[PDB]
């Protein structure tokens, strides 16, 4: 799985 992170701010 690729790393998807929380939306900016």
Distance CA 9, CA 4 (A): 15
- Name the maximum alpha-carbon separation found in the chain: 23
- Please report the DSSP string for 1-9 in residue order: -----PPP-
Side-chain-facing half-sphere of 5: CA atoms under 13 Å = 2
Resolution of the experimentally solved model in angstroms: 2.0
Fill in the DSSP letter of residue 5: -
Integer Cα distance of 9 and 7 in angstroms: 6
């Amino acid at each position: 799985t690729n790393e998807y992170t929380e939306g900016p701010t």
